[PDB]
Symmetry: D2
Subunit: 262 residues, 4 copies
């Protein structure tokens, strides 16, 4: 009855119980998956938000800008799931951009240092996580990252749009590497979801508002910006065996908004 | 406990046991779905092939160019699944293009009457099946059609490519209509699979120039696909379609899912 | 001096002086092109309108659904431009969709016979025109058709959207053929322009939603958009007819103010 | 008579006379444009090379990673074209990626500092150059960047593919900014051309065969002129409704699977 039955999956990116990662985790566990979680910085609070998941799961520290964490990550994951076991799934649900690269801050005024930090964490880290975790993944496995359609420019998102454009490209190359291990690599492009990070993006509020209302309007089946579950289920679909021929790709979990002009 | 358990699903397009629709049907039954089948022309022969499926399934006649078949379709489906029951799934796995519109035949020499028949059967019928069946579909339901990536031109496929481009555009509009029934509409873009249709194009008149190009095309899929592509295995495609028939892609509509080994994401 | 100096170019699609084709012809003539025009159905009326262009141009009858018109087109064009001369450019600026395939008419209620006539005129005719004219075109020549971005679905445009998706695909195959003659094939995807065909998309609400798209277009466009000025689109078509886009084929150039590149 | 007659256009990225920017500059001058050129690193050699252009032109130093070069750029440009005169066109023909992010070097072994430098020079600089130069550009003006279609992954191009993907995203936001000045921003995605940087990536003639094949009108790696003319097209008044966009000067190869 479990879609992810018997699969060992690493899930990064939980910060609150609003986090897309948190809901990915909950739905995965409901579908029989065995998880390992990773958190950044506030492991104290995170450890406790994750206590509210349907089942218990080891929590490892991972700062994707930290070379030492990455070098040790595979070892620490192995310790947590038991030697002789490998990952079946990896969820990258990590993103960051300094305030200067978002909101009403002029596009031209974000210093490259700030952009580079945003691109490091939001795009490059998809590959560096892949580099760490592929040596301990089973054939038939699946890596899934979170995307926000960057095909067109828009207000407020600014340099985070550029980061997602890089991430989409990095994804297609990770797929080439991941293919050597019989592993898939894909992105899920979600509609706007009210999260902690969503909260930080913000005149700029007027625009975000109008964008959101637009999404629900264009989407032929509507879009509930307060429900993370359909996005969570999409990510789990990709972690399962039921999309076995899809890789280097992007699945849109956006109510179909991107397929409609008006 | 099965992916499609308790779902009632119509599956069109079986003609041989190599048909993509045959494998869609088999995997759906393995996952607990209850099927209605539609078939065109050689119904006696199709019943023998559908007899090979794991589970029983009623076989209705449907020529998508027949207005009466389409007008009577919903009523014949209702009769087969019992009144008060609706469908949760529809699979469109139907294609046709006259020989003039494909293969070694010069692109410019396909008469429009031929092209128009191909587009009717291959693209327009997705809308008219949706029109006939949406009134007997449940919310949360899902329509799926079969695609072959037409974003770039290529040898041989010729006017079928134009048909598929039209199909993709039709799908985005079918999704607006289906939206009102709480129903999703998507396409699955498959890599090449060895079916009646496909072998017919290579074996076709090819044994000439288009022959080598087609084979070069086919062998390129496996080469570009980061995880490989096996033309003799339709199951990765059937599963993907089942994934769209299920509740596990609930926020995807008007869209295309690529079941091609990731080949379309790679230039070499 | 002129961008199209010495080029001989066929332009289809003029019905009124609001026609995109009319403005293409004008700018082409201002830039030194010698034109052959083709018109459908109302030829005496069309001559009255093409009289208003800066220069003379033979007017041929061409109904793209008429195999005999296509069969004779090359011969007739060759007589208009004189012995030893060939075409350098062809403009397809032709479209049609019956009222069932557009506006507030339900998408599902359009019979295939109507949809098929629309696709015949709007997409397939691109290929049969290239078929007719490629044998009398010069290496380095250019064929251009008019497009409206169909990558996403939208209110009112309906089955014409499907026709344009077909056209884009046909263009990529026409480029394969044209390339055997050294000829380019491309489309121009224009933003909304106030023409006769545009008038007919609604009826008597579709009119509302079209105004809504209209207003959103100028908004989305980083350089804005004026639906009453065909000239930027005309210039774009002339750019492709010229030698200044010599490595572009089977492709689409967007003359839409950049609107398609912006979400909001 | 000339397509760019009387327009003032800045062209960056010349390093040898095979540079795509060299040929952009040559064709632009042949079309009556008045140029300002910028150069990186080998200024003395570059000067030697721009002497081979059809007309003389001011050479200014610009390392796009140098905040002071960027801060002074507009002033130095106005000094060259004379106060009261503004630019009509800007050409960005600049890129770089460390050898760890390219070739047969494993994708996963390129350190972020290497990737970050490449993105800085190849993607961010398009924005930062526009920020410097938009305040001194005329309405009707045109900014043009060089692209290599990154919509699909491929061998060897590796992390530069990612840079190009970012560049395409950046171009779309620059267009938002440039619209306020009545200025357009677009990219030219070119087919492969035999340049110095092309040489740095390492079959090199095996690549020319494939492209030429797929291109319905063929493709010559030894000829940058069709790419130059395209850029000059975007600099002209003849594509006045195109912005935030990409024009493919690749022989049509990206429209074809085989
Ligand atoms: N919420 C949306 O609408 C939406 C839409 C599309 C895509 N996304 C993407 O989904 C992913 C998750 O974002 P979210 O919406 O759930 O917000 P979130 O704030 O809940 O999660 C962001 C996560 O990034 C992590 N982060 C920042 N720096 C990190 C670092 N050095 N190392 C490890 N983790 C770090 C945070 O700890 C945090 O857990 C992101 O990639 C986001 O861009 C979100
Ligand atoms: N085989 C491949 O490699 C491949 C790849 C991508 C997409 N597709 C698409 O998959 C779908 C099925 O094709 P296939 O490969 O399984 O071959 P197929 O020959 O088994 O399927 C074709 C089906 O369409 C039906 N058909 C033709 N005319 C019809 C009509 N008037 N009414 C109803 N049905 C009609 C046939 O009866 C037949 O069952 C098609 O849409 C095809 O274009 C196939
Ligand atoms: N107006 C816009 O906003 C817009 C935008 C994008 C693309 N387009 C396209 O531009 C092209 C020209 O359309 P328009 O906007 O100038 O309107 P239009 O009404 O002026 O042009 C339509 C033309 O198609 C011709 N036509 C119809 N049936 C024909 C047939 N059998 N044979 C030959 N010609 C036939 C008409 O005679 C007429 O000259 C069309 O392809 C249109 O789809 C228009
Ligand atoms: N040659 C091709 O096949 C091809 C194809 C498509 C796109 N492009 C792009 O065209 C543009 C020109 O490349 P090219 O092939 O002519 O190679 P090139 O080596 O001749 O020119 C590249 C330029 O980048 C400049 N560069 C590197 N770092 C710089 C810095 N800090 N500041 C300023 N300039 C710097 C070099 O000085 C050099 O002039 C590039 O953007 C390239 O990515 C090239
Ligand atoms: C125009 C604004 C877009 C609408 C909301 C969608 C969204 C919300 C949150 C996202 O996560 C981040 C955004 C910026 C920086 C960091 C993160 C994790 C994110 O990547 C996308
Ligand atoms: C030229 C490239 C070779 C690979 C094509 C793969 C393929 C195979 C069969 C397909 O189905 C049809 C194709 C044409 C006509 C009818 C059908 C069902 C189809 O649509 C696609
Ligand atoms: C909601 C959509 C409204 C904006 C569309 C702009 C437009 C205007 C006219 C066009 O030409 C035709 C449209 C339909 C049928 C025939 C033609 C030539 C055309 O193809 C596009
Ligand atoms: C994988 C196929 C081979 C690619 C050939 C085309 C090309 C050649 C040179 C290019 O310029 C650069 C490439 C890398 C780093 C820096 C520059 C300027 C460039 O961006 C693109
Ligand atoms: Na070729």
């Amino acid at each position: 009855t479990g879609l992810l039955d018997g699969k060992r999956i690493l899930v990064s990116g939980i910060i609150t119980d609003s986090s897309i990662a948190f809901h990915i985790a909950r739905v995965a566990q409901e579908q029989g998956a065995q998880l390992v979680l990773t958190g950044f910085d506030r492991l104290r609070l995170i450890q406790r938000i994750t206590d509210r998941l349907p089942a218990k799961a080891p929590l490892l520290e991972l700062d994707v800008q930290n070379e030492e964490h990455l070098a040790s990550l595979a070892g620490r994951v192995t310790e947590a799931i038991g030697a002789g076991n490998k990952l079946d799934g990896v969820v990258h649900s990590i993103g960051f951009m300094p305030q200067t690269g978002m909101g009403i801050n002029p596009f031209f005024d974000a210093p490259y240092a700030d952009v580079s930090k945003g691109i490091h964490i939001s795009a490059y880290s998809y590959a560096s996580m892949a580099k760490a975790l592929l040596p301990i993944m089973n054939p038939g496995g699946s890596i899934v990252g979170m995307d926000f359609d960057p095909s067109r420019a828009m207000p407020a998102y600014n340099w985070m749009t550029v980061a997602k454009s890089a991430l989409e490209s990095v994804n297609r190359f990770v797929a080439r590497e991941a293919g050597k291990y019989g592993v898939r690599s894909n992105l899920v492009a979600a509609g706007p979801i009210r999260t902690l990070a969503m909260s930080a993006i913000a005149e700029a509020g007027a625009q975000i508002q109008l964008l959101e209302e637009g999404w629900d309007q264009r989407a032929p089946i509507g879009w509930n910006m307060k429900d993370a579950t359909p996005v969570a289920k999409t990510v789990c679909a990709l972690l399962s065996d039921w999309l076995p021929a899809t890789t280097g790709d992007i699945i849109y979990a956006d109510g179909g908004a991107h397929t409609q002009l008006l």
